[PDB]
Amino acid sequence: IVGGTESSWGEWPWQVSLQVKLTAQRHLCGGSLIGHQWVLTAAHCFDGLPLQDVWRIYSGILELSDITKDTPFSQIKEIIIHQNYKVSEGNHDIALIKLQAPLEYTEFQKPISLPIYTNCWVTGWGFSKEKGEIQNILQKVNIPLVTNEECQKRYQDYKITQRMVCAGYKEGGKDACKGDSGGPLVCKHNGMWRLVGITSWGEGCARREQPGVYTKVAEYMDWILEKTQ
Ligand SMILES: N#Cc1cccc([C@@H](NCC2CC2)c2ccc(F)c(NC(=O)c3cc(C(F)(F)F)nn3-c3cccc(CN)c3)c2)c1
């Protein structure tokens, strides 16, 4: 997150860290807890995939530095990458993770509701600048959506589809960045947070007139419901 501030304990209880344990353990992506056994993330977060075991999913956490062996984590039972996801294109950037064991809901660990907006927040432990590093304390930033027309105007080299939503400022300075991928874009509807986007990509981070591009969750609701039951 570029241009954001430190989150507080319990503030974003659906935010998870998707980490890989090889020799060292590292955070690769965010995700959003959407049910007791279900995490929603970006398909591109699995572009290294075939490496067997080695995924640990952390929920109810604020600070990556306070992860020890004592820190509980979830394990992956199943990954469902959208059928139309292609590594070479940037389309359909969405995946579900079935956890091996259900997580309980608490004030620290609970799901974002699923189903045009200024009051939107992007969160994660990604870079706070393009030549950046993974952040310790979960960052938050308030960013308005832009129309698809406006976003497409900014990205002549790419196809911005009806299944994408964009968020950014004309003069940049606030954006998601590398390592935020797969985490939430939430917006306030009628006193309640809804998952509007999944952090996907952009031309760098926080550049003027280069907004963040998100997977538009509303356009995948049939696929999310079908795959989860
Ligand atoms: N349609 C389409 C399409 C076609 C080809 C490539 C891409 C896209 N990569 C594959 C998509 C996700 C599956 C793409 C295109 C152009 C780009 F410049 C990038 N780059 C990034 O994204 C990117 C680079 C960096 C960093 F600077 F840190 F290295 N961070 N980031 C990033 C990471 C997260 C958020 C955002 C939103 N500021 C940015 C990514 C998209």
Curated annotation (Swiss-Prot):
Domain Peptidase S1: residue ranges: 1-229
Top-rank lineage group of the source organism: Eukaryota
Carbohydrate attachment residues: 6, 63, 104
Cystine connections: 29-45, 120-187, 151-166, 177-205
Location of the active site: 44, 93, 181
Name of the protein in question: Plasma kallikrein light chain
